[PDB]
Write a protein that binds this ligand. Structure first.
Ligand SMILES: [Zn+2]
Ligand SMILES: [Zn+2]
Lengths: 113, 52, 111
């Protein structure tokens, strides 16, 4: 399952790279009522959300019936699917004000990039 | 119109507001003291075709 | 572009002669008057692309925070280059890249 999750995340990152190249070569479709940058950001966010959901679904399907987190989630007493996904597979994309992390430095998010 | 896309697009075009500033790209002011001719060479052919 | 007065350094406003039918640049602070070369009095760009590639410096290759690619230079065919996006920061601005060679230091695109 960890191999499957890693493969899903890597395929999603390759897809995001392809979207970046298409947007950087004017080959990107523009969502009506939105600019090129907004459409690019929305499409990347949708891809990353789908990646986290797929990895979490793989992780949650892996679990046995004797798994205690699965038992608590199935009883409906505490926890949900997102908790299992973040604990076992992938935390996912962090959103601030409904958008990805901004460029607080000069054209980058941290001085390590 | 609700089950046809072309008529719907026609209605959409007829409803949406469109000003001159939307289709305009650049505006210029030129000096030309001849009402019946012009100094600009690119447009000279078209304006003389109009006047003739 | 607008010219300045050659004697008192003020702006040369355009003026039209009724009797002579000529466009002349005249300073309102004196009697100086110089003959205009072109009739383009004014030009306004509703949609403009200036400043997109105008933000370029000759020492941009010494910045360590800029990414480095291996795209081919059109002039000297170098194997090292530094790229960046558009310096204009409006909402409509494209995401196209500008590449700068490390030898000739010219700005070129990929299209
Ligand atoms: Zn003067
Ligand atoms: Zn070069």
């Amino acid at each position: 399952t960890m191999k499957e999750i890693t493969h899903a995340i890597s395929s999603a990152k390759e897809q995001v790279q392809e979207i970046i190249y298409k947007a950087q070569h004017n080959e990107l479709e523009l969502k009506p009522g939105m600019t090129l940058r907004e459409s690019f950001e929305g499409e990347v966010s949708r891809t990353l959300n789908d990646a986290r959901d797929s990895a979490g679904r793989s992780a949650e399907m892996n679990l046995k019936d004797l798994n205690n987190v699965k038992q608590m989630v199935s009883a409906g007493s505490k926890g949900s699917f997102i908790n299992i996904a973040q604990m076992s597979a992938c935390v996912g994309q962090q959103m601030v004000e409904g958008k990805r992390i901004a460029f607080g430095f000069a054209d980058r998010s941290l001085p390590h990039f | 119109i609700a089950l046809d896309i072309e008529k719907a697009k026609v209605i959409q075009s007829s409803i949406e507001y469109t000003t001159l500033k939307n289709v305009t790209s650049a505006t210029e002011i030129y000096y030309d003291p001849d009402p019946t001719s012009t100094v600009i060479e690119e447009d000279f052919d078209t304006v003389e075709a109009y006047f003739s | 572009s607008f010219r300045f007065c050659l004697e008192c350094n003020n702006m040369l406003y355009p003026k039209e002669d009724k009797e002579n039918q000529r466009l002349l640049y005249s300073c309102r602070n004196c009697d100086y008057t110089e003959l205009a070369e072109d009739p383009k009095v004014y030009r306004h760009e509703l949609i403009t692309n200036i400043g997109e590639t105008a933000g370029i410096v000759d020492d941009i290759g010494q910045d360590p925070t800029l990414p480095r690619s291996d795209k081919e230079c059109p002039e000297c065919h170098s194997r090292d280059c530094v790229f960046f996006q558009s310096q204009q920061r409006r909402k409509d601005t494209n995401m196209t890249l500008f590449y700068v060679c490390l030898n000739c230091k010219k700005t070129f695109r990929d299209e």
